[model samples]
Target: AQAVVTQESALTTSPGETVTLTCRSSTGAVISSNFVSWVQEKPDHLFTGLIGGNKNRAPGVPARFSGSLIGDKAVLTITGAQTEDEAIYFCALWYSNHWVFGGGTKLTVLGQSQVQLQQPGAELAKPGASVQLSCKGSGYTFPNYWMHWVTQRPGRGLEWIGRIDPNSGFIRYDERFKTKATLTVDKPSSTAYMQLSSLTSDDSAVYFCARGCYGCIHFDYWGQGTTLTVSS
Candidate 1:
């Protein structure tokens, strides 16, 4: 579910409008500030820090898009949320993009931060095959949107592999992946999985399964990440 611009639209909230972003996970894990962050990326791919874990803005970030927990919800509030406060508030999981974002939310200026894992099986996989890819997210359909997988290789940023839907079993992959790659979901398990065939050194990476916290729509969430090394 690489965050796709399936459709484009906007939401206009008054300067004081209370905007709440909700995401659900398959696990009963509570949504906390322990592992969530918010950032704003400009149309030019200029990514700026916004908020992280519990009402705190990142270094040099404006006071808006403050993160907090309201009962069972992880909230990012923009007090006096101004016009400049309108921007896409992306909530990335603490260390990775397991459950990623939905379609980039278009805030008039504004906003927040946010939370899984899954393995793969052999359904349509090739023996000892190899494939690598990435997924960004849409931030909708509870947890169907906003989720991805990545390889955690030391001394590297992150090797984005691919992603899948926990509820729908659908997957959109990085072009590098095709018939050789398979990202699947087993909803009853509340997790997503990926299967790669024809193992190769280039197919190495840390795989991950992403989901929205509590399954809410709004790009923001990630998993610890699973590393995959091919020695076959």
Candidate 2:
């Protein structure tokens, strides 16, 4: 069975207060080797990477946000929290081949109530055949942001597929997915596309497209997700 990641559904704190968000795994005690990553999500689908690889803060992350291991849980601590820090925080645990995500923690800074924002299709392909998936974003400047792809197998955790720069068309893929997936973008249409080749049943999963933040590898805006089924 896939390990289940757990987190508090909601947490409340006051401005300047110190708060810590916790992430636990059902498989065993969480440790640095697990490669835990933390991301912050604001309303309207905006997301930013805070900490990665357990304790490595993202390039633009503020010093006030820190990550560490407290006993069996991986924790993200926000020191001197501000109103702007009020958002949903998500934790992802990276296994050797896949990643598990917690439900997320809704942080409410005092006097600032949170506002929620609303964040696809299925495909069947035969073995050895190839398939292409598309993701389009609106209500924001599309070409200015980077697009990332993730995969979640049925009853399993998530996996990072890769990313594409919409403006420059630059691309980066996880080592594992380097040959399995290809990423492209249509600047004029503001749409990102991913093509997966050499399909097998193991490739079946729900694919998600997300907007990435500058200087950070985390996703902020997310697509609804598209289901892909590889069959004979």
Candidate 3:
């Protein structure tokens, strides 16, 4: 299992009402003064940082966005919520030069968004062979939506691999995965794929596909996870 960022899956309110989004770290209760950040992810793959570790709003973000600590969980409170405020929100903590994000919360001001993940639960491949994992989105159309890839070893935190725009063919890969993985998309089918090459025992881990920014650094929705094992 993995440490997850727990949040409410859906929240609904009036145009001028207030809504609160909370995120907790799985490792333990987060100290009030710890370095934490809140991010907003929309269906368009646009991501923006709302608050920083110091509980200060990020520049260019509206004053309605605020962050604070509620017990051991970090909370993002949105006051006077508008229709545009409806989006996926994520909270992350900085540790060991990496950021671990929560599973994400979808806030709905009007219509609701229902996205699904279509992927294989487990897969096997021999060394030096190519394997592809797929993810498809439902309840939303795929035009500018970007798909991000992530990895988690047994008992390890999440690691970002990269992201790609299936429609535009634009892609970005993390320095560590650039040499080992390739991402591809099929717009007509609304499906995204990640291909791992030259697989070895080190590639044995769980792979995930998420809907997020082109850089693949942030996400609010994710796939079911594809377990990949490369053995002799």
Candidate 4:
């Protein structure tokens, strides 16, 4: 069965008010070991990482954005909500060697107004083989930002693959995917690439490429997501 991560679909708050977004997992009690990460998505698909590893705030994250474990759930608290803070909040949990993202909570600051990727459709690879995927970022300065890769198994949740600094070509993996994936970027062409090796049934999933903010783990813009089928 697929592991489930749950969150409230929407929430309402007022300026100077306090709001809390909760993330719960179906596998077991939420604990620090789960390494929960909190991200905020605003208009134009702008995403920024707020909290990581349960309590570690990303650089430049306001003190009002805090994370904690309360009972069986992990919570993200915004101490003093502002109209500018109104956005969709997503929480990710690290469980069973994979990452799971909640459905996301839409935060409404009572006084604020609301506002609203090319990848291959699919790819097929054989077991014990390898496949490389590509994502071309357009309409933006791609090389100036970080690129992140994610995976979602059928009926499951999103898993963090890793991220790469396009300008410097520095990369970081989720440890679990370190041996299974390789990340690279083409600064001049504005494309990010990921190669998966030692393919297995477990590697069959939809892969996504996203644009991330500096010093944060959150993603703002996302690719169309390409499905990969690993078979015999």
Candidate 5:
């Protein structure tokens, strides 16, 4: 069975206080102790792998970030929370057969920012034709980040399409999307693009371009997302 992961939609904590974020899996239990990681996504699209496995923190991550298994779910705890720590957080679990990510927790430290995403609100395409979706990032160090695409259909969860390197145009995609999605970049314009071809009913969804930190699995910053409804 496919796995479904979820996180609390939003969180509020005081600076210098401690808070915990929970990620739950729909499957029976999170059978693997060494398979969970916690990632942080900032307002400007910066990403960092804070904790890997049940407790190991990635190098350079603050000591405040910690991960552990609680009953059947995975949790991330932040001690001495700071304003800078205010951002979206995600949990990623590697099941024996697949990778599942939480919907993301939007952590607000209060009096903080503010982000956006730009794309054609509506796009139409016919079978055998191609459609291009683009996202431009601002208010961050654009060149150093990787831009990834994600999709969501009506009443469904999110799908990781793939990503492109803003500097080199190198691409990596979720295997499921490899045959259908192509990622590209315009380094000069600070924009990332994804072209989905051979459109069909299944291709109709809202597409988003999100920012990924070099070593993290969480998509921290997201464009408002674009809607594409493909038909004959």
Candidate 6:
């Protein structure tokens, strides 16, 4: 099973208070811990703070911007809500050569985040299960660019699973993925997919299709994930 990303700061969240969350990898790959985090564009096209590993924060980040390791999960909390939580929040997984993001949470502040229904990020697939992960980019050469698979268990930083090089039928798997995962890219379709065996709720977060260079250099890009649900 992929380890739970100890998001020491998982909370229901409320307006006017800083809320925190964390992420991690199940495979134990450091890259799994390394992230390519970003912020939501919101349904409105306006942007906000984007930050990740090396403590990188995107432009316009506020002084209140900060993150810390609460155990395994990388924590991101906003000191004050400018109604920015109105957008869907996400974190990307970064590798030296590849990129990906979590199927984030849409914070309505006053309403419920659909993520609550997903009930935890997805987990390691059953030992031989064929799990399908989906990624859809809005405006980019998802094929020409590198796309990767990442996993988040409940609350944790993003985890790097194996990767599929659309440019080549080539794939590289983490120790965990090497044994239990299969990755495929349909260049013609512009989608990156990963199949995992023996499914469980632990592998349940919204799987994101992300674009990046090698080693998840940075998920310079990602597709909003297809909310995935696993059950008997």
Cα-based lDDT for every prediction = 0.47, 0.77, 0.74, 0.78, 0.73, 0.53
Stretches of candidate 6 exceeding 4 Å from the true structure: 1-81, 85-129, 155-157, 214-217
Model 2, 97-206: lDDT tens digits are: 45567878989999660111122567788999999898877766777787878876664445678778877877878777999999998777767888999999999888
| Poorest stretch of ten by lDDT in candidate 2 | 112-121
After superposition, candidate 1 runs with Cα above 4 Å error = 1-10, 26-29, 94-99, 109-232
For each candidate, give its TM-score against the true structure.
0.40, 0.59, 0.56, 0.59, 0.62, 0.50
Ranking by TM-score: 5, 4, 2, 3, 6, 1
The residue-level lDDT of candidate 4 at 2 comes to 68
| Residue 26 miss distance in model 5 (angstroms) | 8.4
State which candidate has the highest lDDT: 4
Ranking by lDDT: 4, 2, 3, 5, 6, 1
User: What's the true lDDT of residue 173 in model 3?
Assistant: 81
The clash count for each model shown is: 54, 1, 0, 1, 2, 42
Model 4, residue 133: C-alpha shift (Å): 6.2
lDDT of 2: 0.77
Q: Which ten residues in a row have the lowest lDDT in candidate 3?
A: 212-221
lDDT string for model 1 (1-232, tens) is 2332111235567666776654333233326533555555454333454555545555445655567655644556666666666566554443233333323456664332322232332112233765533333332343445355544334333333455555565565655455556776544444454557777655555554444333342223444344456663
Q: How far is candidate 2 from the true structure (C-alpha RMSD, Å)?
A: 7.6
